[PDB]
Amino acid sequence: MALRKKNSLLNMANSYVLDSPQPSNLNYFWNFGSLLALCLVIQLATGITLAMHYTSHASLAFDSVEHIMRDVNFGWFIRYAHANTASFFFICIYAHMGRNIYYGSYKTPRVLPWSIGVIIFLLLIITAFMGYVLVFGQMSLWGATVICNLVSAIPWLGEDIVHFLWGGFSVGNPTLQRFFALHYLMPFVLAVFALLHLIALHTAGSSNPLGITSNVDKLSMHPYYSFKDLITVFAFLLMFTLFVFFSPDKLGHPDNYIPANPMVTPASIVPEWYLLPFYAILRAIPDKLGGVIAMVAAILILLILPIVDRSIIRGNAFKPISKLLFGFFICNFLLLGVLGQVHIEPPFIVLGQICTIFYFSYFLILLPMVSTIENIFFYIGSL
Amino acid sequence: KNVIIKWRGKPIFIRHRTSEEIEEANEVNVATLRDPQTDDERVQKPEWLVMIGVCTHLGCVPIGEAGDFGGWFCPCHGSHYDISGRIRRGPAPLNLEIPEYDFADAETLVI
Amino acid sequence: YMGWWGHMGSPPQKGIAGYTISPFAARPFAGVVHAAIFNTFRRTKNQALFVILPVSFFYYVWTQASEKNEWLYTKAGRHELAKAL
Amino acid sequence: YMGWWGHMGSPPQKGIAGYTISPFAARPFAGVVHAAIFNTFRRTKNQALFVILPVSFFYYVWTQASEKNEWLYTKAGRHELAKAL
Amino acid sequence: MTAAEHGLHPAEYPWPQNGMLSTFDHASLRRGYQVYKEVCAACHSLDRIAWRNLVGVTHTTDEAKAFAEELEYDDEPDDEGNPRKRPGKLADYIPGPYPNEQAARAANQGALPPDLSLIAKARHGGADYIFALLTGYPDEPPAGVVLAPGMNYNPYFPGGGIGMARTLFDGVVEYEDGTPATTSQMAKDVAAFLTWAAEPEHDERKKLGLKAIIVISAMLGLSVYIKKFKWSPIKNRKFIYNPP
Amino acid sequence: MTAAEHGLHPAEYPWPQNGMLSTFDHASLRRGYQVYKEVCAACHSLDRIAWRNLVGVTHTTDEAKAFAEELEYDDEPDDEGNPRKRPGKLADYIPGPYPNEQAARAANQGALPPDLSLIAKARHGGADYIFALLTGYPDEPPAGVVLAPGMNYNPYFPGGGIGMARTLFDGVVEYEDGTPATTSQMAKDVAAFLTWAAEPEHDERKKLGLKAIIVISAMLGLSVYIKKFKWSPIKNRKFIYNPP
Amino acid sequence: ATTFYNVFVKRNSAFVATILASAFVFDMTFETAIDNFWDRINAGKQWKDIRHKY
Amino acid sequence: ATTFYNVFVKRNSAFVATILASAFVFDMTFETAIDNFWDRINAGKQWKDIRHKY
Ligand code: HEC
Ligand code: HEC
Ligand code: HEM
Ligand code: HEM
Ligand SMILES: CCCCCCCCCCCCO[C@@H]1O[C@H](CO)[C@@H](O[C@H]2O[C@H](CO)[C@@H](O)[C@H](O)[C@H]2O)[C@H](O)[C@H]1O
Ligand code: FES
């Protein structure tokens, strides 16, 4: 017996990255998993490096970030790499989630990797939000103020909880130091959950774009998917290069280059682009508590896809109506994103409400109806 | 007279308003006010206007007694606040915020 | 639901002969120009509606909304804005 | 070298009958006083030399060294210290 | 919002540094420093720039040391613990015009002139906004605009009323290189200079990006050949089925 | 090393706070504060203690506010940006006698009197060392000791020559509680006070430790019963072997 | 004894509820008991004992 | 061709050695080449181009 199989430690690597049996027909959308692993590694490397130069005290934080940009050798690169990779992390995560929804990766027997995945997505949001605060520019402060005052909507104890999270009566030094500690920690938790969702997936293996079993025709993960992963790694690094070296501030907001000033409020407090759809959902509900619940429900509702998809067939490759519905769902999710950054003015107020209804009605009405009808069409249509 | 107490970095305007000042503030119809509020909503004690003296526009501190509604005038972009510290004229959207203040004694307030 | 090499969990296979040639014996880019043109055209044509319909609809919605919003905050749109608030 | 329940990797067992009683049927502290005194004495007596010999030796070494060091840095030890450096 | 409330959006001007392969014009950077020093520095600080930062960008080591040595900075206390001043060194930061915010606001009718070290990154528009703002004070405010006292009309500034008056007029600076100091020339130079101040790595960053683009492109091309090569046995597989 | 180079080791005195269950004597803490204020504070700072720290330990809220309000502290600048002073508040730290190290050393023939906020934790010996040092200046240095200029002989101080002269003499303080202010009494009180300053959680810490000791002891006893109970089927197992 | 067993112990839901309620009571009473004991062994020493002079 | 294969490619130790030596040479030459190109496309703009005036 070969050492890679005999030795317990080597065998675990072997089972995941080398002899792992994969379907032979995964397409390029199965490459986002490894890109997300690459983003996670870049964020750990750049993150730990910035932590060696950053000072978490509110009197010095913003200046420490300027020191990184101006004095540390390649500090500009490390800072922009870290900031831009956070955007790429969300592009890849939305793609990976989109792949999973389109191809029915959430169906049995893969409900558990999917459900852990939904938690990974929540941790990523929290991680990225805390990191944004650490700069302690105007968007940092006003972000922490607004978002932590949503917690005030929790009945009875909400106000108390806010003051407890801030460590005082406003966002200030205690808040900044605790966000630093948590921002450092959260990526490690996120890595553990990423590993859990893979271990959960190992029982069934990867789904594939046809939605049929692959037990009939498997390929080793290495070398075939190793070499296919390199193509998207280099494509990713090309995109990374264009942002980091040529347009490092394109995805960001100028207001964060102004030091936090509790008096002056910025013109518009909008979150980072990747949070914008959830922000639009929150604005849609007029009630404070209602809005918060809706915004959380917009993420947690993904947990019910295994129930509401009633199809006897896995995924959308062969389902024309489901494909149309999915197209509309995805475009609506982008429109929500755009409405997250417009002003609260006519006619965008009502439009945002309609888009919010459409978002939820996909999970609660349309997907159950459409999947039921397609079942009947496949049966009658093939008689 | 109007005092300026720093409290959590923000200035606090404390004005000891006269009888006729109170009267002047109680006049303006709530209807015609960017931020509609009456003095009774603002003060817990009519002789103690206590406000957070940051202008609601960008965040300069209004010069008191100046204005056009004889309360506070932000010199930065020329916004005029009232004797209630309500916004009347200029770029500022809101009335000057009221802190949580309590009269522990009748001669001392805690903010 | 998945095993491992040797016991993957396939139904018994019999009667299929599979054939292939070495990477060093094959032209890796054989028929690449034909595929790049004709195959991509076929595959794109077949999926075009599923992209075009939702994108065009949501772009139209946005365009109408953004143009109205712009117009409401002009002088001409004063009255319509007053009603809308 | 270790399996799991059912196939642990024992040589075949045959001929041993094992018996035990429920925790609720037993006195958990039965004969505790006898054990605490006589059993601990037996077990300690049997291991005493393996602790006493090395500890006593290294304590003696340390004691001699620390006393010499102390004496060298007195007035009386001036000459011996001068030679030692 | 009204367009007024947003501010007019600045034109896209063709800066020398626009362009994936383009550096700053360092002669413009030098001229821009001279505008900063003679006009802006009256009210605006540049606190994030040290004298050493000018060296080998706009000035030689000698010129920068000369600038530093003309100023007095706080030294460590003497032996009786009394305060002392020293002449400036290259490691010193360029000192601001005011001791604190309160003094700054008192001198500027309540307004606080921002520090300019990051202003090119801290406004939408960047150099284009700075250029548009400094050159965009109309002789007369559009009829019907009511300016608050001590405000100046400038359409690029959100809301229209800015506390900073027009400051660049033809020949307020006499450039040491003989360039005609027109309002537009000075605004272009100072906007270039401030952009450099905000992002001083700009030139190096774009050269390393060119190297990265080339290598990563080559690796992408090769990775595609290697993928196709290793995958060809799978793509070329054929079956013959004889039902049992 | 010679004993001289180490310093004489201080006696173990029976402090009120020695003892697992013992708090500080707060009346001694109060008297010790008065010694600090009237003797040590001339040369030594206590920078880590704020006026609020005395409240409910040695002083009432009123007494501490009175102490704070007698002093002037730096305020934020006025509206013209000119510097200003304010009266002290409870949140203020007790202010030191010197503006910087240089001024401190100049006043003390080169020696720098350390800050006393942590001195009880920062020396081997703690309160015993402080007590021994303050009371251990002999009238005459042991015959043959050559003191450097500006040094005083004290055997508890490593090396023997300390830059701090004897300062406690009978009746340098007049205690407000009528206690006779003997050298020994003042040293005991000030040593208690400084120990409190270094470890102000001491009283609370020891009470929580008592609760923890009791609960953890009970849990230890119960854990042993439960272990013995669950293990008894294994310990009591018997075998009968019949060779096949 | 059987009664006690049947009510508080037999169902784990009841047993856990009894343990938690006991923990609540213990916590509250133990706090009070230690407080008083600590005050007696450190009598005349604490601020509460000298506060009255001021 | 066979010769080239046998010397530089057949043994992986030799292949890896050849790759690393090539990487060293590429790294050094590419640095120099980009430097010169960058200087030509940005001619008269860089400090090195104006330094001589001072
Ligand atoms: C004597 C005063 C004064 C001079 C000279 C001056 N400024 Fe200013 N500047 C101000 C004040 C005051 C503000 C704040 C205006 C406000 O917030 O209303 C300001 C604001 C600015 C802003 C930011 C406007 C914004 O978007 O917030 C920039 C950029 C600026 N100045 C650049 C310059 C440059 C470049 C020069 C000269 C080359 C210059 N200033 C000369 C006083 C001055
Ligand atoms: C007028 C000066 C002066 C007065 C009064 C004074 N000290 Fe000091 N003290 C010093 C100087 C100077 C040193 C540093 C001596 C040295 O390091 O040689 C010092 C050192 C100390 C040390 C540290 C010795 C060491 O191990 O480093 C303690 C503890 C101390 N003082 C406590 C007190 C206490 C308690 C009082 C009065 C109740 C007091 N001092 C009064 C000047 C003074
Ligand atoms: C999933 C992993 C991570 C994500 C998504 C993430 C995201 C972010 C984001 C969005 C910012 C704000 C960037 C900016 O605009 O400047 C940031 C800042 C920061 N992050 Fe992370 N981060 C991650 C991991 C880490 C880790 C592991 C560390 C280790 C300490 C770290 C340290 C920092 C530091 C010090 C900053 C502040 C300095 C700065 O703003 O550049 N990050 N992070
Ligand atoms: C750090 C973030 C994540 C990483 C690194 C990660 C990584 C991966 C990898 C490597 C795979 C196997 C390869 C692939 O199919 O692409 C995978 C599969 C999967 N992931 Fe993720 N993932 C992450 C986040 C998520 C999230 C947010 C979800 C769901 C909301 C999710 C759900 C899944 C599912 C369901 C699969 C199985 C899909 C299938 O092969 O059919 N993951 N993930
Ligand atoms: C992804 C990064 C690379 C590091 C590896 C990831 C760490 C996760 C590994 C810890 C989980 C243990 O992983 C578990 O171990 C065993 C052997 O290793 C695998 O077992 C599998 O492979 C072995 C031989 O390769 C076969 O005996 C077995 O029939 C098969 O199921 C499990 O399918 C896997 O779930
Ligand atoms: S800042 Fe108060 S008027 Fe604009």
Side-chain angles (χ1 to χ4, degrees), chain A residues 29-34 36-37 40 89 93 96-97 99-100 105-106 110 113-114 116-121 190 194 197-198 201 205-208 302:
Chain A
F29 284 99
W30 265 253
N31 286 24
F32 288 104
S34 70
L36 285 163
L40 189 50
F89 218 136
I93 214 148
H96 188 71
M97 283 163 51
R99 181 286 311 268
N100 295 333
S105 300
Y106 51 83
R110 298 175 182 88
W114 167 253
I116 297 162
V118 163
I119 282 156
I120 294 166
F121 180 63
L190 194 154
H197 100 308
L198 291 184
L201 179 64
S206 287
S207 180
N208 61 79
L302 293 175

Short mmCIF file of all heavy atoms in Angstrom, two decimals, chain A residues 29-34 36-37 40 89 93 96-97 99-100 105-106 110 113-114 116-121 190 194 197-198 201 205-208 302, ligand 4:
data_model
loop_
_atom_site.label_atom_id
_atom_site.label_comp_id
_atom_site.label_asym_id
_atom_site.label_seq_id
_atom_site.Cartn_x
_atom_site.Cartn_y
_atom_site.Cartn_z
N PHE A 29 -17.98 26.79 -13.24
CA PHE A 29 -18.57 27.30 -12.02
C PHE A 29 -18.25 26.42 -10.82
O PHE A 29 -18.64 26.77 -9.71
CB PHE A 29 -20.07 27.37 -12.18
CG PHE A 29 -20.46 28.54 -13.03
CD1 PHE A 29 -20.75 28.38 -14.38
CD2 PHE A 29 -20.54 29.81 -12.47
CE1 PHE A 29 -21.08 29.48 -15.16
CE2 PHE A 29 -20.89 30.90 -13.25
CZ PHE A 29 -21.15 30.74 -14.59
N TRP A 30 -17.65 25.24 -11.01
CA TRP A 30 -17.21 24.50 -9.84
C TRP A 30 -15.84 25.00 -9.38
O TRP A 30 -15.24 24.46 -8.46
CB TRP A 30 -17.20 22.99 -10.08
CG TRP A 30 -18.45 22.30 -9.63
CD1 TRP A 30 -18.59 21.49 -8.54
CD2 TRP A 30 -19.74 22.35 -10.27
NE1 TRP A 30 -19.88 21.04 -8.46
CE2 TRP A 30 -20.62 21.56 -9.49
CE3 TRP A 30 -20.25 22.98 -11.41
CZ2 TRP A 30 -21.96 21.37 -9.82
CZ3 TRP A 30 -21.58 22.80 -11.73
CH2 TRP A 30 -22.43 22.01 -10.95
N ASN A 31 -15.35 26.07 -9.99
CA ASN A 31 -14.04 26.52 -9.57
C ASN A 31 -14.11 27.61 -8.51
O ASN A 31 -13.08 27.99 -7.99
CB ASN A 31 -13.23 26.99 -10.76
CG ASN A 31 -12.73 25.87 -11.64
OD1 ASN A 31 -13.29 24.78 -11.68
ND2 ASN A 31 -11.70 26.18 -12.41
N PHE A 32 -15.30 28.12 -8.17
CA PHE A 32 -15.37 29.16 -7.16
C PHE A 32 -14.99 28.68 -5.77
O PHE A 32 -14.48 29.46 -4.98
CB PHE A 32 -16.72 29.85 -7.19
CG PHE A 32 -16.81 30.71 -8.42
CD1 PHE A 32 -17.55 30.29 -9.51
CD2 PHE A 32 -16.10 31.91 -8.51
CE1 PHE A 32 -17.62 31.07 -10.66
CE2 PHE A 32 -16.17 32.68 -9.65
CZ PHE A 32 -16.93 32.26 -10.73
N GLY A 33 -15.23 27.40 -5.47
CA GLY A 33 -14.81 26.86 -4.20
C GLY A 33 -13.32 27.07 -3.97
O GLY A 33 -12.91 27.54 -2.91
N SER A 34 -12.50 26.74 -4.97
CA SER A 34 -11.08 26.92 -4.76
C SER A 34 -10.73 28.40 -4.81
O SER A 34 -9.79 28.80 -4.13
CB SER A 34 -10.28 26.13 -5.74
OG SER A 34 -10.43 26.70 -7.03
N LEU A 36 -12.53 30.70 -3.49
CA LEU A 36 -12.84 31.18 -2.16
C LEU A 36 -11.75 30.73 -1.19
O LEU A 36 -11.45 31.45 -0.26
CB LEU A 36 -14.18 30.62 -1.74
CG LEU A 36 -15.41 31.26 -2.37
CD1 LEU A 36 -16.60 30.33 -2.20
CD2 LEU A 36 -15.69 32.59 -1.72
N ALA A 37 -11.19 29.54 -1.39
CA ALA A 37 -10.07 29.12 -0.56
C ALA A 37 -8.86 30.03 -0.77
O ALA A 37 -8.21 30.42 0.19
CB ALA A 37 -9.74 27.70 -0.88
N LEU A 40 -9.51 33.30 0.95
CA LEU A 40 -9.34 33.15 2.37
C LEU A 40 -7.86 33.13 2.73
O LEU A 40 -7.43 33.80 3.65
CB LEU A 40 -10.06 31.87 2.78
CG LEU A 40 -10.18 31.63 4.27
CD1 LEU A 40 -10.73 32.87 4.96
CD2 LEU A 40 -11.10 30.45 4.49
N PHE A 89 -13.80 38.30 -2.56
CA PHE A 89 -14.37 37.26 -1.73
C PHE A 89 -15.88 37.24 -1.93
O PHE A 89 -16.48 36.18 -2.04
CB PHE A 89 -14.10 37.52 -0.26
CG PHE A 89 -13.79 36.32 0.59
CD1 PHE A 89 -12.74 36.37 1.50
CD2 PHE A 89 -14.54 35.16 0.53
CE1 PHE A 89 -12.42 35.27 2.30
CE2 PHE A 89 -14.23 34.07 1.34
CZ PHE A 89 -13.18 34.13 2.23
N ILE A 93 -18.27 34.48 -3.61
CA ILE A 93 -19.19 33.78 -2.74
C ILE A 93 -20.58 33.85 -3.33
O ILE A 93 -21.35 32.91 -3.19
CB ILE A 93 -19.15 34.24 -1.27
CG1 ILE A 93 -19.41 33.06 -0.34
CG2 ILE A 93 -20.15 35.35 -0.98
CD1 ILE A 93 -18.70 33.17 0.97
N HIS A 96 -20.54 31.27 -6.07
CA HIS A 96 -20.59 29.94 -5.53
C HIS A 96 -21.99 29.63 -5.04
O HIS A 96 -22.51 28.57 -5.35
CB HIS A 96 -19.63 29.93 -4.38
CG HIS A 96 -19.36 28.61 -3.77
ND1 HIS A 96 -18.65 27.63 -4.42
CD2 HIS A 96 -19.59 28.17 -2.53
CE1 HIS A 96 -18.49 26.61 -3.60
NE2 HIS A 96 -19.05 26.92 -2.45
N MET A 97 -22.63 30.57 -4.34
CA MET A 97 -24.03 30.39 -3.95
C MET A 97 -24.95 30.29 -5.16
O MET A 97 -25.88 29.49 -5.15
CB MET A 97 -24.53 31.51 -3.04
CG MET A 97 -24.03 31.37 -1.62
SD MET A 97 -24.14 32.85 -0.57
CE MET A 97 -25.83 33.40 -0.76
N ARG A 99 -24.21 29.20 -8.19
CA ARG A 99 -23.99 27.87 -8.72
C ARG A 99 -24.81 26.88 -7.91
O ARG A 99 -25.52 26.07 -8.49
CB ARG A 99 -22.49 27.53 -8.68
CG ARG A 99 -22.09 26.17 -9.23
CD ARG A 99 -22.38 24.92 -8.41
NE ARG A 99 -21.97 25.02 -7.03
CZ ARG A 99 -20.78 24.63 -6.58
NH1 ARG A 99 -19.91 24.13 -7.43
NH2 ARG A 99 -20.46 24.77 -5.32
N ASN A 100 -24.72 26.95 -6.59
CA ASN A 100 -25.41 25.98 -5.76
C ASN A 100 -26.92 26.05 -5.96
O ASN A 100 -27.57 25.02 -5.95
CB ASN A 100 -25.22 26.22 -4.28
CG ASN A 100 -23.79 26.04 -3.85
OD1 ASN A 100 -23.04 25.30 -4.47
ND2 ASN A 100 -23.42 26.75 -2.79
N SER A 105 -27.62 22.15 -5.68
CA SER A 105 -26.69 21.61 -4.71
C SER A 105 -27.29 21.61 -3.31
O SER A 105 -26.74 20.97 -2.43
CB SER A 105 -25.45 22.39 -4.68
OG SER A 105 -24.82 22.39 -5.95
N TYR A 106 -28.40 22.31 -3.08
CA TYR A 106 -28.93 22.27 -1.73
C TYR A 106 -29.83 21.07 -1.51
O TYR A 106 -30.20 20.83 -0.37
CB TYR A 106 -29.77 23.51 -1.42
CG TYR A 106 -30.79 23.74 -2.48
CD1 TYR A 106 -32.00 23.07 -2.48
CD2 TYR A 106 -30.48 24.56 -3.55
CE1 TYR A 106 -32.91 23.25 -3.51
CE2 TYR A 106 -31.39 24.76 -4.57
CZ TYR A 106 -32.61 24.11 -4.55
OH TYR A 106 -33.49 24.31 -5.57
N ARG A 110 -27.39 16.78 0.04
CA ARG A 110 -26.39 17.78 0.39
C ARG A 110 -26.98 18.91 1.20
O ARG A 110 -26.43 20.00 1.14
CB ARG A 110 -25.70 18.36 -0.84
CG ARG A 110 -24.96 17.30 -1.62
CD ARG A 110 -24.39 17.87 -2.89
NE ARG A 110 -23.76 16.73 -3.53
CZ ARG A 110 -24.37 15.88 -4.35
NH1 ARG A 110 -25.64 16.04 -4.68
NH2 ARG A 110 -23.68 14.86 -4.83
N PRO A 113 -24.06 20.31 4.00
CA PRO A 113 -23.07 21.27 3.52
C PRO A 113 -23.72 22.59 3.16
O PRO A 113 -23.12 23.63 3.37
CB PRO A 113 -22.44 20.67 2.26
CG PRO A 113 -23.13 19.35 2.04
CD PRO A 113 -24.02 19.06 3.23
N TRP A 114 -24.94 22.56 2.64
CA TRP A 114 -25.60 23.79 2.27
C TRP A 114 -25.91 24.62 3.51
O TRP A 114 -25.76 25.83 3.48
CB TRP A 114 -26.87 23.48 1.50
CG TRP A 114 -27.81 24.63 1.32
CD1 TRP A 114 -29.00 24.82 1.96
CD2 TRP A 114 -27.67 25.74 0.41
NE1 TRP A 114 -29.60 25.97 1.52
CE2 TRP A 114 -28.81 26.56 0.58
CE3 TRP A 114 -26.70 26.13 -0.51
CZ2 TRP A 114 -29.00 27.73 -0.15
CZ3 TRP A 114 -26.88 27.30 -1.22
CH2 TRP A 114 -28.02 28.09 -1.05
N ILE A 116 -24.56 24.49 6.53
CA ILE A 116 -23.35 25.07 7.11
C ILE A 116 -22.88 26.24 6.25
O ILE A 116 -22.33 27.20 6.77
CB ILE A 116 -22.25 24.01 7.22
CG1 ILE A 116 -22.66 22.89 8.16
CG2 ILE A 116 -20.92 24.63 7.61
CD1 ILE A 116 -21.83 21.67 7.95
N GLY A 117 -23.03 26.11 4.94
CA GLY A 117 -22.63 27.17 4.03
C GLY A 117 -23.36 28.46 4.35
O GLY A 117 -22.76 29.52 4.31
N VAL A 118 -24.64 28.36 4.71
CA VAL A 118 -25.37 29.59 4.98
C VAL A 118 -24.78 30.29 6.19
O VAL A 118 -24.71 31.51 6.24
CB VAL A 118 -26.87 29.31 5.15
CG1 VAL A 118 -27.57 30.48 5.83
CG2 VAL A 118 -27.50 28.95 3.81
N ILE A 119 -24.25 29.52 7.11
CA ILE A 119 -23.63 30.13 8.27
C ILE A 119 -22.28 30.75 7.90
O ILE A 119 -21.95 31.81 8.40
CB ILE A 119 -23.57 29.05 9.35
CG1 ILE A 119 -24.96 28.92 9.97
CG2 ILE A 119 -22.48 29.32 10.36
CD1 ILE A 119 -25.22 27.59 10.62
N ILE A 120 -21.51 30.08 7.04
CA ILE A 120 -20.28 30.67 6.55
C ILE A 120 -20.58 32.05 5.98
O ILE A 120 -19.82 32.97 6.18
CB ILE A 120 -19.62 29.78 5.48
CG1 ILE A 120 -19.15 28.44 6.05
CG2 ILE A 120 -18.50 30.53 4.77
CD1 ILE A 120 -18.82 27.44 4.97
N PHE A 121 -21.68 32.17 5.24
CA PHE A 121 -22.01 33.42 4.59
C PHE A 121 -22.29 34.50 5.62
O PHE A 121 -21.80 35.62 5.47
CB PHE A 121 -23.18 33.25 3.64
CG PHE A 121 -23.56 34.53 2.94
CD1 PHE A 121 -22.67 35.16 2.08
CD2 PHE A 121 -24.81 35.07 3.12
CE1 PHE A 121 -23.03 36.34 1.43
CE2 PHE A 121 -25.18 36.23 2.44
CZ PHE A 121 -24.29 36.86 1.60
N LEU A 190 -14.37 31.21 10.50
CA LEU A 190 -14.86 31.03 9.15
C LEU A 190 -14.13 29.89 8.46
O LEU A 190 -14.76 29.06 7.83
CB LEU A 190 -14.60 32.36 8.45
CG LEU A 190 -15.30 32.58 7.13
CD1 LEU A 190 -15.44 34.07 6.95
CD2 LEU A 190 -14.44 32.03 6.01
N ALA A 194 -15.70 26.51 6.98
CA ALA A 194 -15.46 26.14 5.60
C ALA A 194 -15.01 24.69 5.56
O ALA A 194 -15.46 23.91 4.73
CB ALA A 194 -14.43 27.04 4.98
N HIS A 197 -18.03 22.40 6.14
CA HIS A 197 -18.96 22.12 5.07
C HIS A 197 -18.32 21.18 4.05
O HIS A 197 -19.04 20.38 3.47
CB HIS A 197 -19.60 23.40 4.57
CG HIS A 197 -19.04 23.98 3.34
ND1 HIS A 197 -17.69 24.23 3.17
CD2 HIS A 197 -19.65 24.44 2.23
CE1 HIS A 197 -17.51 24.80 2.00
NE2 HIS A 197 -18.70 24.96 1.41
N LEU A 198 -16.99 21.17 3.94
CA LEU A 198 -16.37 20.19 3.06
C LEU A 198 -16.45 18.76 3.60
O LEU A 198 -16.62 17.81 2.84
CB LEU A 198 -14.92 20.55 2.79
CG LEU A 198 -14.77 21.80 1.95
CD1 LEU A 198 -13.34 22.09 1.59
CD2 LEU A 198 -15.65 21.73 0.72
N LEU A 201 -19.71 17.54 2.92
CA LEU A 201 -19.96 17.21 1.52
C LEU A 201 -19.32 15.88 1.14
O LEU A 201 -19.73 15.26 0.17
CB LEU A 201 -19.36 18.34 0.68
CG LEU A 201 -19.50 18.16 -0.83
CD1 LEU A 201 -20.95 18.17 -1.28
CD2 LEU A 201 -18.72 19.26 -1.53
N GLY A 205 -20.14 13.51 -2.07
CA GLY A 205 -19.36 14.09 -3.16
C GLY A 205 -20.05 15.28 -3.83
O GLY A 205 -21.23 15.57 -3.59
N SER A 206 -19.29 15.95 -4.70
CA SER A 206 -19.79 17.02 -5.55
C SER A 206 -20.98 16.58 -6.38
O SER A 206 -21.04 15.47 -6.90
CB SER A 206 -18.71 17.53 -6.43
OG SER A 206 -17.80 18.29 -5.64
N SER A 207 -21.94 17.49 -6.50
CA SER A 207 -22.97 17.35 -7.51
C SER A 207 -22.30 17.68 -8.84
O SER A 207 -21.11 17.94 -8.87
CB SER A 207 -24.06 18.29 -7.17
OG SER A 207 -25.11 18.21 -8.11
N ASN A 208 -23.05 17.63 -9.94
CA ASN A 208 -22.46 17.94 -11.22
C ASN A 208 -23.52 18.64 -12.05
O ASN A 208 -24.69 18.63 -11.71
CB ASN A 208 -21.97 16.70 -11.96
CG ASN A 208 -23.06 15.69 -12.26
OD1 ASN A 208 -23.82 15.85 -13.20
ND2 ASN A 208 -23.15 14.66 -11.45
N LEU A 302 -32.62 31.08 2.90
CA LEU A 302 -31.90 30.11 2.10
C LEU A 302 -31.96 28.72 2.72
O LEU A 302 -31.83 27.73 2.00
CB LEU A 302 -30.45 30.56 2.00
CG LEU A 302 -30.23 31.84 1.21
CD1 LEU A 302 -28.78 32.23 1.30
CD2 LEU A 302 -30.66 31.68 -0.23
C1 HEM I 4 -15.16 30.46 2.74
C2 HEM I 4 -16.22 30.26 2.01
C3 HEM I 4 -16.31 28.99 1.27
C4 HEM I 4 -15.34 28.14 0.77
C5 HEM I 4 -13.83 28.27 0.84
C6 HEM I 4 -16.02 27.08 0.14
C7 HEM I 4 -15.34 26.06 -0.52
C8 HEM I 4 -16.01 25.06 -1.20
C9 HEM I 4 -15.39 24.06 -1.95
C10 HEM I 4 -13.92 24.01 -2.14
C11 HEM I 4 -16.33 23.21 -2.40
C12 HEM I 4 -16.07 22.02 -3.25
C13 HEM I 4 -15.79 22.52 -4.68
C14 HEM I 4 -16.91 23.30 -5.35
O1 HEM I 4 -18.02 22.75 -5.59
O2 HEM I 4 -16.75 24.49 -5.70
C15 HEM I 4 -17.59 23.69 -1.98
C16 HEM I 4 -18.79 23.01 -2.25
C17 HEM I 4 -19.97 23.56 -1.71
N1 HEM I 4 -20.14 24.71 -0.98
FE1 HEM I 4 -18.80 25.95 -0.49
N2 HEM I 4 -17.33 27.25 0.25
C18 HEM I 4 -17.58 28.38 0.92
C19 HEM I 4 -18.77 29.02 1.24
C20 HEM I 4 -19.97 28.40 0.93
C21 HEM I 4 -21.22 28.96 1.09
C22 HEM I 4 -21.50 30.35 1.56
C23 HEM I 4 -22.15 27.99 0.73
C24 HEM I 4 -23.61 28.07 0.74
C25 HEM I 4 -24.33 29.12 1.11
C26 HEM I 4 -21.46 26.84 0.32
C27 HEM I 4 -22.15 25.72 -0.06
C28 HEM I 4 -21.44 24.74 -0.71
C29 HEM I 4 -22.14 23.57 -1.26
C30 HEM I 4 -23.60 23.25 -1.17
C31 HEM I 4 -21.23 22.82 -1.88
C32 HEM I 4 -21.48 21.52 -2.59
C33 HEM I 4 -21.76 21.89 -4.02
C34 HEM I 4 -21.55 20.78 -5.00
O3 HEM I 4 -20.41 20.37 -5.32
O4 HEM I 4 -22.54 20.34 -5.58
N3 HEM I 4 -20.15 27.13 0.47
N4 HEM I 4 -17.36 24.82 -1.22
#
